[PDB]
Every structure is written in C-alpha cells, then in structure tokens.
Amino acid sequence: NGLKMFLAALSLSFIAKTLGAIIMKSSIIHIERRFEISSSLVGFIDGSFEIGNLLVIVFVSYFGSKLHRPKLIGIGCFIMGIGGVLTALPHFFMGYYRYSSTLSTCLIMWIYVFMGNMLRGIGETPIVPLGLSYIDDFAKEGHSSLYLGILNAIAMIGPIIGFTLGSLFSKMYVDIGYVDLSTIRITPTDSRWVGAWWLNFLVSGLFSIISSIPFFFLTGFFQSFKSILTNPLYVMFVLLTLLQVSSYIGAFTYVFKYVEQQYGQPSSKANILLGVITIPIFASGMFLGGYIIKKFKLNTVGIAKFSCFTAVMSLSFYLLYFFILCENKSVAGLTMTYDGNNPVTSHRDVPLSYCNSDCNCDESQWEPVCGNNGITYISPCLAGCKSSSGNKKPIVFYNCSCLEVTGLQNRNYSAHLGECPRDDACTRKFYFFVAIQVLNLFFSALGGTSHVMLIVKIVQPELKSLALGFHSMVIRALGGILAPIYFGALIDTTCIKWSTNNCGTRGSCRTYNSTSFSRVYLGLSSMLRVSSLVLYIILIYAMKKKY
Ligand SMILES: *[C@@H]1O[C@H](CO)[C@@H](O[C@@H]2O[C@H](CO)[C@@H](O)[C@H](O)[C@H]2NC(C)=O)[C@H](O)[C@H]1NC(C)=O
Numbered sequence: 001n002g003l004k005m006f007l008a009a010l011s012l013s014f015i016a017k018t019l020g021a022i023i024m025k026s027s028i029i030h031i032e033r034r035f036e037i038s039s040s041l042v043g044f045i046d047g048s049f050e051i052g053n054l055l056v057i058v059f060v061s062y063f064g065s066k067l068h069r070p071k072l073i074g075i076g077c078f079i080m081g082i083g084g085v086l087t088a089l090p091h092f093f094m095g096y097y098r099y100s101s102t103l104s105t106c107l108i109m110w111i112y113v114f115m116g117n118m119l120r121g122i123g124e125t126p127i128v129p130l131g132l133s134y135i136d137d138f139a140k141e142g143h144s145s146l147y148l149g150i151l152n153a154i155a156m157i158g159p160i161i162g163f164t165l166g167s168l169f170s171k172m173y174v175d176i177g178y179v180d181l182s183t184i185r186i187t188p189t190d191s192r193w194v195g196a197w198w199l200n201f202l203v204s205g206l207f208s209i210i211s212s213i214p215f216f217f218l219t220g221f222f223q224s225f226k227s228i229l230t231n232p233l234y235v236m237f238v239l240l241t242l243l244q245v246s247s248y249i250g251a252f253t254y255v256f257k258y259v260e261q262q263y264g265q266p267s268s269k270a271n272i273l274l275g276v277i278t279i280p281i282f283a284s285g286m287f288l289g290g291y292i293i294k295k296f297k298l299n300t301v302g303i304a305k306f307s308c309f310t311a312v313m314s315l316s317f318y319l320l321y322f323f324i325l326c327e328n329k330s331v332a333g334l335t336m337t338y339d340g341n342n343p344v345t346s347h348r349d350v351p352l353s354y355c356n357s358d359c360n361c362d363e364s365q366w367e368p369v370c371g372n373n374g375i376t377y378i379s380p381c382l383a384g385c386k387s388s389s390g391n392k393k394p395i396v397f398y399n400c401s402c403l404e405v406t407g408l409q410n411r412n413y414s415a416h417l418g419e420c421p422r423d424d425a426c427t428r429k430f431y432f433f434v435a436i437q438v439l440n441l442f443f444s445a446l447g448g449t450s451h452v453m454l455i456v457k458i459v460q461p462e463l464k465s466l467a468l469g470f471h472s473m474v475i476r477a478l479g480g481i482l483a484p485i486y487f488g489a490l491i492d493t494t495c496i497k498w499s500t501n502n503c504g505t506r507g508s509c510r511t512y513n514s515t516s517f518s519r520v521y522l523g524l525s526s527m528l529r530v531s532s533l534v535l536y537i538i539l540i541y542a543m544k545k546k547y
C-alpha cells in the first residue's frame with residue numbers, strides 16, 4: 001500500500017501531460033490569427049517545447065536518480081503548471097479585438113507563448129525516467145509489466161477531455177464577459193473569427209498544479225555514459241526501436257490524406273466516428289499485453305520473442321493494403337485532353353481546346369466541377385458553362401461548352417459542384433481498409449509494453465534512468481521531428497497541380513496521382529518495418545547465445 005499510493009499520483013500526472021500536449025496543438029490557429037504573426041514565427045513557437053525537452057532530459061535522468069524522486073516529479077509537475085498559466089497573460093494585458101461567390105462562368109507578446117511552451121517542455125522531463133525506474137526498483141516478481149500496462153491504459157483520458165472542451169471553447173467569442181455578445185457581427189464560419197484560446201490554458205495549468213500536491217507527502221557522469229554506449233544489445237535495441245517508431249509516426253501522420261486521395265471520403269466520414277471506436281481497442285490491447293507477460297512468467301528472451309511475434313503478425317496485415325486499391329480519377333485537362341478525346345503523357349503544358357478557346361480565364365483557378373458525363377473539369381470556365389442558378393443549393397451551371405457529349409446532346413448539360421463520387425466498389429474496398437486498419441492497430445498495441453521492460457533488463461541495475469532518458473531523447477529527436485519532414489518531402493513528388501500562392505509558387509497541392517502516392521507511402525512503411533524486424537531477430541540470436 002506504499003507503492004499503490006505512488007501508483008495513483010503518477011496516473012494523474014500522465015493524464016495532465018497528454019492533456020497539455022493536445023491542447024497546445026488545438027489552439028495554434030487562433031493564436032496565429034489573434035496575434036497578427038508570420039508563418040515562420042508560428043513554426044518557431046510551435047518548436048519551443050522541443051528545445052526545452054531535448055536539452056535537459058539526460059541531466060535530469062542521471063543527476064536526479066539519487067535525490068528524492070517523488071519530490072522531483074512533483075516539482076516538475078508544478079513547473080509545468082506554472083508554465084501553462086503564463087501562456088494566457090497576453091489576453092489580459094492587450095486590448096480588445098479591434099478587427100471584429102467567385103462562380104465565374106465563361107469569361108471572354110509572442111515571447112510569452114514561446115517562453116511558456118519552453119517552461120512546459122522543461123517541466124515534464126522527470127515523469128517517465130524517474131517514475132518507471134522507481135516502479136521497477138520497488139515491486140514484486142512480475143508486477144512491473146501489469147502496472148505499466150494499467151498506466152498506459154488510464155492515460156487515454158487526457159485526449160478525451162482535451163478534444164471535448166477544446167471544441168467547446170473554440171465556439172465562444174474571444175472577448176467573452178467583457179463585451180456584450182449582442183453587437184457581434186462575426187460568426188464561427190467567418191475568416192476573422194478568433195475563439196477563446198486563452199481559456200484552454202487556464203484549465204490545463206490549474207489541472208497540472210493540482211495533480212502535483214500528493215507527491216509532496218509520499219566525473220561519474222562520463223564513465224556512466226560511456227559504460228552504456230559500449231553495450232551492444234542496448235545499441236541494437238535502440239536502433240530498431242527507432243526504425244519502428246519512425247514508420248508508425250509517418251503512417252499515422254499521412255493516413256488521413258491517403259484515405260481522401262485514394263477512396264474519396266471527405267475527412268468527416270473517415271475521421272470523427274473512427275476514433276470513437278479506435279481508442280478502446282488500443283487501451284485493451286495495451287492492458288492485455290501487460291497482463292500476458294505477467295501471467296505467463298516470461299524472462300528476457302521470452303519477452304523478446306513475444307514482441308517479435310507481435311511485430312511479425314502486425315507486418316503480415318500491412319501487406320494487404322497493396323491488394324485493395326482503386327483506379328485513378330479522371331480530370332479532363334490534367335492528364336487527358338480538354339475535350340476528352342485523347343490521353344496525354346505530361347501533366348504540364350497541356351494545350352487549350354476548341355471548345356475552350358474563346359473563354360479566356362485563369363488556369364491557376366481550381367474550382368470543383370463535374371458534369372453528368374462522369375469526368376472532371378478544373379473550372380466552370382474551363383468547361384464552358386455559360387449559365388448559373390443563383391446562390392441556392394449548389395448552382396447547376398448549364399449549357400456547357402466542353403460538357404457536350406455524343407448521345408448526351410439529348411439530355412441536360414448541367415454540372416453540379418463537387419467531384420462526382422467513386423463507384424460502389426471503391427466504398428466496398430474502403431470498408432476492408434478500415435477493418436484491416438483496426439486489426440493492425442490492435443496487434444501493434446499488444447506489444448507496446450516490451451520496450452521499457454527490456455531496456456530495464458538488459459542494463460546494470462543502477463543505470464536504469466540514464467538508459468530510459470537517452471532512449472527517450474534519441475526517439476523524440478530522430479523519429480518525431482525528422483519523420484514527418486522526410487515522408488512529406490517524398491510524397492510531394494506525386495503532385496500534378498500546385499496552388500501558386502502570391503509569392504511562393506507552391507502554396508499547396510490540389511491533387512495527387514493516387515497510384516504513385518500509394519506506391520511511395522506503403523513502400524516506405526514496409527521497408528522500415530522489415531528493417532526493424534531484421535535487427536530484432538538477430539538481437540534474439542545474440543541474446544540466446546549470451547544466457
Ligand atoms: C443553350 O444556350 C442557348 C444559346 O444561349 C440557349 O438558347 C435560347 O435561350 C433562351 C432562353 O432559353 C431562348 O432564346 C431560347 O429558349 C433558347 N433557344 C434559342 C436557341 O433561342 C438555350 O436556352 C440554352 N440551353 C437550353 C436551356 O435549352
């Protein structure tokens with residue numbers, strides 16, 4: 001009952017940590033819009049949490065391992081809360097928020113946010129290295145796995161509360177309470193709407209300050225650091241762990257864009273409902289993964305073989321994506337001739353057609369256009385439609401120049417806005433995609449406890465915190481910040497139309513060749529998986545040869 005009490009407090013701190021993370025990302029757009037700030041400065045401010053975290057994660061790990069640990073964790077949580085409160089003072093010190101079509105037919109105080117994010121990042125560092133090593137040092141024969149599984153399962157209450165109230169706070173006017181809301185002309189659907197972003201940080205800061213009260217009642221550096229980097233098993237494990245986590249990060253970063261470009265679901269069918277059933281599977285997988293290791297009495301090689309088996313069984317489900325793909329969308333003008341007559345070889349420098357010769361409009365324009373013929377037009381002017389239907393339900397343009405078709409003359413040449421959806425087969429395949437995805441997520445969550453349970457076992461009983469700290473540092477550096485950058489750089493090789501911004505020729509992409517997208521995305525993930533898997537198998541051979 002002395003470890004049980006310490007066990008409760010750490011759960012509260014885990015919840016607070018996750019809440020703070022998801023809060024920060026949720027409030028970034030409003031801050032950019034309220035503060036009148038550049039995009040480079042936004043990329044900078046968002047990166048502060050990393051400058052504070054990566055700078056002191058190793059020193060707190062080593063030097064804090066011989067002081068009072070429960071008190072260090074409480075001090076860290078208090079610093080995190082104080083930093084969370086500091087991010088909301090600009091609102092109280094600045095002033096009031098002063099600021100308060102295109103159919104086109106044929107045409108012939110930021111330092112405060114920075115230094116608060118830095119304080120938060122500096123403050124969360126003592127939770128994982130000093131908490132888990134404390135749990136491992138004082139525990140019975142096999143209960144460390146079960147405890148870590150319960151901990152990782154309980155922590156999912158942070159994202160729930162965050163997503164719940166960050167969406168409720170983003171539908172209030174920013175100056176709520178000081179102004180009377182009856183004279184406000186702006187609505188959440190406008191372009192200048194800023195919500196109450198300062199209210200997201202008060203609740204998180206006070207929660208982090210509250211969750212730290214129970215904790216208050218419960219020359220060698222260099223050789224200790226060199227004695228850890230000459231241990232082969234540790235280096236091999238860290239490497240593969242890195243490869244696998246990089247693969248996961250990239251996949252979860254671009255799955256939502258892949259699903260939209262491949263199958264056609266508009267980020268609301270595939271987004272909201274999915275998570276509601278995707279999170280309990282993760283929680284149950286984590287808890288059961290811990291419970292199995294506890295119940296079956298596994299040693300080091302047993303844990304290694306169990307996690308290798310889970311990795312294999314989760315990689316065998318990943319290679320089924322290559323077999324449920326659809327055909328490529330057809331947009332007249334992009335890859336085919338503007339009159340549908342013939343195919344082309346270059347996405348660039350397609351010539352204008354007879355049906356569209358007279359109507360001189362901006363090619364750079366990208367407005368969804370689809371006629372009853374089934375194909376796609378870049379713009380209502382590029383299709384030749386010289387009529388409208390008013391601001392009613394999407395205005396059906398009519399009597400189109402390039403919508404005319406043989407045998408279609410005896411019909412209604414009228415194109416609705418919005419791309420014509422895919423056939424039924426593509427939906428039927430989307431359902432198989434979702435099923436396989438939840439299966440792979442379950443089988444990859446069943447083995448997430450083994451990393452900590454192995455790093456602790458393959459290292460001297462006194463260098464447990466330093467090892468976990470260096471592991472966390474390397475992973476959060478080379479697999480959380482680099483991972484999205486290279487995947488994104490690689491993916492952009494498959495664009496066929498760019499949104500030419502005022503200065504930058506590439507503001508964003510309109511469409512992407514779906515076949516090459518799937519090729520690059522799934523190939524990178526599969527190659528990384530094999531990479532990490534290989535290292536682990538060899539590692540198992542070395543382990544079995546050692547003991
Ligand atoms: C297709 O465009 C032609 C030429 O603009 C339209 O021709 C006339 O449009 C007005 C109003 O409908 C009237 O002069 C006649 O009803 C149309 N016929 C002609 C040639 O005089 C035509 O209406 C358009 N497509 C439709 C709706 O039939």
Ligand SMILES: O=C1OC2(c3cc(Cl)c(O)cc3Oc3cc(O)c(Cl)cc32)c2ccccc21
Pocket residue numbers: 248249251252253255282440441444445447448
């Ligand atoms: O970023 C994430 O990576 C994984 C993930 C994270 C950990 Cl620690 C783990 O132990 C397993 C794991 O499994 C997957 C598998 C995937 O196919 C994708 Cl596409 C993301 C994640 C994940 C699961 C649930 C929410 C977010 C993530």
Ligand SMILES: *[C@@H]1O[C@H](CO)[C@@H](O)[C@H](O)[C@H]1NC(C)=O
Pocket residue numbers: 398399412413414
């Ligand atoms: C389109 O089809 C329906 C029925 O014929 C009606 O809207 C009208 O007669 C046709 N012409 C257009 C473009 O509205």
